[PDB]
Structure formats: structure tokens, C-alpha cells
Scaffold this active site. Structure first.
Site, PDB file in Angstrom:
ATOM      1  N   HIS A  40       4.837  32.863  25.683  1.00  0.00           N
ATOM      2  CA  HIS A  40       5.031  33.935  24.664  1.00  0.00           C
ATOM      3  C   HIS A  40       5.899  33.376  23.522  1.00  0.00           C
ATOM      4  CE1 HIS A  40       3.234  36.890  27.341  1.00  0.00           C
ATOM      5  NE2 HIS A  40       4.358  37.169  28.054  1.00  0.00           N
ATOM      6  N   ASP A  83      -0.960  44.955   5.121  1.00  0.00           N
ATOM      7  CA  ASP A  83      -2.399  44.618   5.046  1.00  0.00           C
ATOM      8  C   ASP A  83      -2.455  43.154   4.640  1.00  0.00           C
ATOM      9  OD1 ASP A  83      -5.188  44.711   4.730  1.00  0.00           O
ATOM     10  OD2 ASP A  83      -5.123  46.584   3.553  1.00  0.00           O
ATOM     11  N   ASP A 134      -1.800  44.199   9.711  1.00  0.00           N
ATOM     12  CA  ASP A 134      -2.740  43.142  10.150  1.00  0.00           C
ATOM     13  C   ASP A 134      -1.929  41.958  10.684  1.00  0.00           C
ATOM     14  OD1 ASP A 134      -4.769  44.936   9.443  1.00  0.00           O
ATOM     15  OD2 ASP A 134      -4.937  44.022   7.444  1.00  0.00           O
ATOM     16  N   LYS A 137       2.227  38.763  22.009  1.00  0.00           N
ATOM     17  CA  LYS A 137       2.577  40.011  22.725  1.00  0.00           C
ATOM     18  C   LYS A 137       4.006  40.469  22.399  1.00  0.00           C
ATOM     19  CE  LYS A 137       0.855  41.144  26.770  1.00  0.00           C
ATOM     20  NZ  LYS A 137       0.850  41.093  28.253  1.00  0.00           N
ATOM     21  N   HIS A 138       4.949  39.556  22.086  1.00  0.00           N
ATOM     22  CA  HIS A 138       6.398  39.914  22.124  1.00  0.00           C
ATOM     23  C   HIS A 138       7.189  39.512  20.868  1.00  0.00           C
ATOM     24  CE1 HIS A 138       5.573  41.681  25.911  1.00  0.00           C
ATOM     25  NE2 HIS A 138       5.167  40.524  26.435  1.00  0.00           N
ATOM     26  N   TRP A 180       6.146  48.727  31.405  1.00  0.00           N
ATOM     27  CA  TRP A 180       6.469  47.356  31.867  1.00  0.00           C
ATOM     28  C   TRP A 180       7.943  47.337  32.278  1.00  0.00           C
ATOM     29  CZ3 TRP A 180       4.660  43.109  33.754  1.00  0.00           C
ATOM     30  CH2 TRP A 180       5.475  41.987  33.816  1.00  0.00           C
ATOM     31  N   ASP A 212      -8.693  44.218  31.316  1.00  0.00           N
ATOM     32  CA  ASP A 212      -8.131  45.531  31.708  1.00  0.00           C
ATOM     33  C   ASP A 212      -8.965  46.641  31.054  1.00  0.00           C
ATOM     34  OD1 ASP A 212      -6.171  45.016  33.674  1.00  0.00           O
ATOM     35  OD2 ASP A 212      -4.912  44.069  32.142  1.00  0.00           O
ATOM     36  N   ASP A 245       2.365  49.297  35.744  1.00  0.00           N
ATOM     37  CA  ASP A 245       2.434  47.816  35.835  1.00  0.00           C
ATOM     38  C   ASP A 245       3.673  47.459  36.675  1.00  0.00           C
ATOM     39  OD1 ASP A 245       2.237  44.957  35.052  1.00  0.00           O
ATOM     40  OD2 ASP A 245       0.690  45.688  33.609  1.00  0.00           O
ATOM     41  N   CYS A 283      -0.540  47.639  39.110  1.00  0.00           N
ATOM     42  CA  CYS A 283      -0.727  46.189  38.835  1.00  0.00           C
ATOM     43  C   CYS A 283       0.270  45.306  39.599  1.00  0.00           C
ATOM     44  CB  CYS A 283      -0.680  45.866  37.354  1.00  0.00           C
ATOM     45  SG  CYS A 283      -1.282  44.195  36.995  1.00  0.00           S
TER      46      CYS A 283
END
Ligand SMILES: CC(=O)N[C@@H]1[C@@H](O[C@@H]2O[C@H](CO)[C@H](O)[C@H](O)[C@H]2O)[C@H](O)[C@@H](CO)O[C@H]1O
Length: 570
Positions: free
Chosen positions: A101, A129, A177, A183-184, A330, A354, A361, A384
């Protein structure tokens, strides 16, 4: 106490003092220069448009006099169109739970709240954008793995111990965008993170208390919709059970995410992370996991150095992180998800590993209660993996998912699914996820299994891995039954509910969750109410919730006491 400032793209001059409507500022750069104080207000004129601009605030309010960012005048929501500007240096100060990550780099954020506490932001329209002229990345491909992370509203706690009271209310966040993959990083509509303090001994452990995200509308933001709580202290939560002591010291306390609407979210719609008893309620998501597919999510991500976070020259399989669910926790303790709607979590058939609306989770004590879902591409609920423990899934309604309702994907410990009504679409011939293996235990009680179709459904295996228990369930239009000594077996043509399968397939015209917590309500869900002499009536067992959630009421807000009915309606 405090000073009111005015900003008009229209009428303003940055050489004004900006302290009256007659003498407003022109650009947000004037606010960015200020150190804001208790009772201060920043009022953006309605009809204003702040092109290539951003709010990167400094200062802090007080409990009694928070900073307020809001509007004055009349016309359209004031618009902050950041267009890849609003640059800042993100650095967690150590690697995250997966060393791959990304955890440091330049980020573009329309609004950045870094160690700003006691602040309330309302009434704005916000974009980030990639599609404009002077965009710093020019015509770079939207899905390059090294696209810069982008946020609508980025939050950072780092050098001020516990940050208290950050409210985002009635923000319209669209066309953020961001990076398709990461993810983090603060990457998506709203993303709050906790970075390693410069000197933890000096300023204290960084964490959040009292974070309220409410009444917001998000459309076409990626990767995340709303994420709150990813922390440098991720390594303090590596046990299956999560102690109150760990959660209060390191976790995000008093997190409320409510009355939000999300459409066209690239990845996960709503996720609470490292949060102590978060409340997630009255949210609506549709068409999320928009970019979790083999077309958009098509370029490989670098392997990162486990110490420095720098690319190594190695690349991961393109599938890394190509998974998203709807609205879920999470590494939370006793998270409550109630009164939410989730439609069309997309792409389980084209590279989303998924695609569930609901995902208990890794974490401890997750309770999904009184929720509705329709047309999701995977099972209604995933539990999960081996650190998903102490799970309650009750009094929910699910219809027309593209898989059977249950995904116990190697979950562990006490797992209770009771008093749900599951409308299973014709031709599925299963109650289980089609590839996650179904190895985890479930205690299944008082559920309606309602198989749509002209012929009886078939279920090949009611007890995969031998650790499924059943008591007091109802089985409509299926050719075999599990080992349920108190099963209610019902043939096609015998009515069980007023109009099974007549739940809504679309979000409300006003995009708000349709309330069903007062049983004087007539609701769009009333087709799941039991008919006179329903075979569900008085056929359930009294539940013991071994996670400590006492049975209070049904989906519709009817009090539940004594011998219950089977399914989501008492
Ligand atoms: C245990 C597991 O693999 N869970 C999946 C989630 O992936 C984790 O997500 C957290 C989020 O804070 C971290 O990124 C962690 O490193 C991941 O393992 C995944 O996000 C959800 C949604 O698709 O599904 C689970 O399969």
C-alpha cells in the site's frame, strides 16, 4: 467571538480586508493564508466558482465556538473546482498493514483538514476532475498506476494528539478522478487518515474523536467514496478480538456516517477503519465498484520497499486490490450498520473478487441490522477471514442479488444470521457464494429463504465444511432442506408475505434512505410483511445473541418479545 470572512469569485478583491459583504476576498488563497480561531466563519458566496483553487486550512475552533465554513447570498452552491491543484505531501511515517500500500507521496485535495479540529463545513460543491486544460497531469491515462492521488475532502491527524469534532454536512462531491488502485492514500471523495506524529512523546498519540459525515451526495469519485480512520497505529490491532483499551487509545471514537448518498464510486462506497463503536445509518449507495473490473483496473502496481515505501522495480499481478464491497467495517469494534440501502455493487462477473453490499471484514462485534439490499453482483453478506469474529446479521431484507445470500469466507468464532428475509432470484440454485469456499461457521435461525421461480430451486450442499447450524428457518420452493428440526417447508403458491420480491430496484427520486423505524410507516418494503396465517407466524425460536446485542425490534420497528415470527417482520 471570532471574525466572519466573505469570498466572492464575482465581486471580491484580495486587497480588500474580506470582513464585510461589501469588501469580500476574491480567491480561497486569502483563507489559506489565515490562522483560523474559535468562532471564525468562512462564507463563500452562492453563485461563486473557485477554478483551480482549494481550501487548505490552518488553526482550530473550540468546543463552544467551532470554525464554520458555509455560504452567504443566493444562487448555486459555491463551487471549488480544484482540477489537480491543492498539492501537499502525504506521509504516514511508516509502512501500512500490507507493505505494498502506497503510504507517502504528493496528493491533490480540494479541501485539506490537517490537524484542524472543532470545524464544520456545509453547503459546498467540490470537484477534482482530471479533464481540464491546465491539469498538471495533462492527457495522462486516467488508469496509469502512478496517477497522483486526489481527494474531495482529505483529513489528517498527526501533530495535535486527539483531533476533536470535524463535521462535513450537505457537501456535493463529484468528479474526483483519483488513482484507480491505491487503497490508503487520501484517494476518493472523503478520506480521513492518521499519520505518525513528529514527536509522539511531545504531542501525544494521534487519533480522531467525533467525526460526523452527514447529508452529503457523492457521484463519480474514485477510488474510495467515504473512508474514515486508516492509521499509522494499524499494528496495534493485529489480534482477532479488539480491546476497549486499544480502541480508546489508538482508534477513531464517536464516528457517525449518516444520511449520505453515493453513485458511481470507483471502489468501496463507505468504510470505517480502526473505529470504536462507529454508527453507519440511513446511507444509500448504487453502482459502486464502477472501476473494479478488468477494463479500468488493467495496469500493474509497483512492489514497495518494506522500509522506504519506494518502488523496487518489481510489479504485482494486475488483480492486486481488485476487490470492493458496498458499506462495511475494517478493524472496528462493535460497529453498527442500520437503516442503509445498497444497490448494484458492480462487477463480480468481470474482475471484482468481492461485490457484496455488506462485508463484516476483519474486526470484532460488527452488527448489520434493519438494512435493505437489491441487485448486488455478489452475496448479501461476507464474513471475511480468520480475524472476522463476533458477528450479528439480523432483521435485514435482501432481494435479487446475483448470488445466494451467504459468504462465510473463512470467518471464525461466533457468527449469527437470524430473522432475515432473503428473496433469492430464479436460477441461482444456491444459498452460498460461488467461489469463496464457504468454510466459515454460521448459526442460522429464524430466516426466510424464499426461492423465486417456476420450478423448485436446488441446493446441492446445505452444510459446506460441516459447521453450518440451522433452527426455525422457513424454506419456500426448494427441493431439499438442511438439518433444521424446526424447519417450516412451504410450496410454491402458498403465500408467506404480502408481495415477496416487490422491494424497490432503484434509489428514491430524492436520493434519501426510505425510513422504516416507526411501524405506523407504510413503506416500499411492505411486500415483506407476513400475511394473515403466514406459516412464518409464531414459528421462530427466542434468540440468544452471544455477541451481546439484545433483540429489540424487527426491520419495521415493531417491538419483539417472546416467541418471534420467522423472518424480518414480526
Ligand atoms: C481480509 C481481507 O482480505 N479483506 C478484504 C479487504 O481487503 C483488506 O482491506 C483493508 C482495508 O483497510 C486493507 O487494505 C487490507 O490490507 C486488505 O487486506 C477488502 O478491502 C474488502 C473489500 O473488497 O474485501 C475483503 O475481501
Amino acid at each position: 467571538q471570532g471574525t466572519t470572512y466573505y469570498v466572492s469569485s464575482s465581486k471580491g478583491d484580495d486587497s480588500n480586508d474580506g470582513t464585510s459583504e461589501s469588501k469580500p476576498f476574491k480567491t480561497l488563497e486569502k483563507i489559506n493564508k489565515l490562522t483560523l480561531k474559535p468562532g471564525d466563519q468562512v462564507l463563500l458566496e452562492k453563485g461563486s466558482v473557485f477554478n483551480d483553487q482549494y481550501l487548505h486550512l490552518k488553526g482550530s475552533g473550540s468546543a463552544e465556538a467551532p470554525i464554520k465554513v458555509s455560504t452567504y447570498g443566493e444562487g448555486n452552491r459555491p463551487q471549488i473546482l480544484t482540477n489537480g491543484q491543492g498539492l501537499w505531501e502525504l506521509n504516514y511515517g511508516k509502512h501500512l498493514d500490507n507493505t505494498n500500500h502506497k503510504w507517502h507521496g504528493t496528493v491533490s485535495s480540494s479541501i485539506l483538514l490537517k490537524d484542524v479540529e472543532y470545524i464544520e463545513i456545509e453547503g459546498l460543491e467540490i470537484t477534482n476532475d482530471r479533464g481540464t486544460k491546465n491539469d498538471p497531469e495533462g492527457d495522462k491515462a486516467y488508469n496509469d498506476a502512478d496517477c497522483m492521488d486526489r481527494t474531495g475532502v482529505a483529513g489528517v491527524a498527526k501533530d495535535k494528539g486527539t483531533l476533536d469534532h470535524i463535521v462535513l454536512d450537505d457537501l456535493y462531491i463529484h468528479d474526483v478522478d483519483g488513482n484507480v488502485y491505491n487503497k490508503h492514500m487520501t484517494n476518493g471523495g472523503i478520506y480521513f487518515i492518521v499519520e505518525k506524529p513528529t514527536d509522539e512523546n511531545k504531542t501525544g498519540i494521534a487519533k480522531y474523536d467525533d467525526v460526523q459525515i452527514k447529508n452529503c451526495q457523492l457521484d463519480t469519485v474514485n477510488r474510495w467514496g467515504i473512508a474514515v480512520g486508516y492509521t499509522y497505529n494499524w499494528d496495534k490491532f493485529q489480534t482477532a478480538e479488539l480491546s476497549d483499551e486499544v480502541m480508546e487509545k489508538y482508534g477513531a471514537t464517536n464516528v457517525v456516517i449518516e444520511n449520505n448518498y453515493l453513485n458511481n464510486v470507483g471502489g468501496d462506497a463507505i468504510t470505517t477503519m480502526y473505529a470504536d463503536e462507529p454508527l453507519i445509518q440511513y446511507n444509500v449507495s448504487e453502482n459502486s465498484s464502477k472501476q473494479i473490473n478488468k477494463t479500468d483496473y488493467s495496469k500493474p502496481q509497483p512492489v514497495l520497499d518494506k522500509v522506504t515505501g519506494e518502488p523496487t522495480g518489481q510489479y504485482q499481478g494486475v488483480g492486486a486490490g481488485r476487490v470492493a464491497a458496498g458499506i462495511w467495517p475494517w478493524k472496528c469494534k462493535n460497529a453498527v450498520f442500520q437503516y442503509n440501502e445498497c444497490f448494484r455493487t458492480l462487477n463480480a462477473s468481470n474482475g471484482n473478487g468481492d461485490g457484496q453490499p455488506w462485508d463484516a471484514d476483519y474486526g470484532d462485534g460488527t452488527n448489520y441490522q434493519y438494512n435493505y439490499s437489491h441487485g448486488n453482483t455478489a452475496s448479501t453478506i461476507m464474513f471475511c477471514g480468520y480475524q472476522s469474529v463476533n458477528n450479528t446479521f439480523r432483521y435485514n431484507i435482501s432481494q435479487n442479488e446475483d448470488m445466494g445470500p451467504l459468504d462465510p469466507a473463512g470467518n471464525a468464532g461466533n457468527t449469527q444470521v437470524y430473522n432475515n428475509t432473503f428473496y433469492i432470484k430464479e436460477g441461482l440454485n444456491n444459498i452460498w457464494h460461488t467461489s469463496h469456499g464457504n468454510a466459515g461457521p454460521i448459526n442460522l435461525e429464524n430466516n426466510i429463504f424464499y426461492f423465486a421461480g417456476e420450478t423448485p430451486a436446488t441446493v446441492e450442499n446445505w452444510n459446506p465444511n460441516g459447521n453450518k447450524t440451522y433452527s426455525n428457518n422457513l424454506f419456500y420452493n426448494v427441493s431439499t432442506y438442511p438439518e433444521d428440526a424446526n424447519a417450516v417447508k412451504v410450496d410454491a403458491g402458498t403465500k408467506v408475505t404480502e408481495n415477496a420480491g416487490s422491494g424497490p430496484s432503484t434509489v428514491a427520486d430524492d436520493k434519501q434512505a426510505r425510513r422504516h423505524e416507526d411501524p405506523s410507516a407504510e413503506t416500499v418494503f411492505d411486500g415483506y410483511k407476513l400475511v394473515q396465517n403466514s406459516p412464518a407466524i409464531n414459528a421462530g425460536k427466542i434468540i440468544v445473541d452471544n455477541n451481546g446485542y439484545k433483540v429489540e425490534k424487527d426491520f419495521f420497528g415493531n417491538k419483539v418479545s417472546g416467541i418471534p415470527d420467522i423472518g424480518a417482520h414480526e
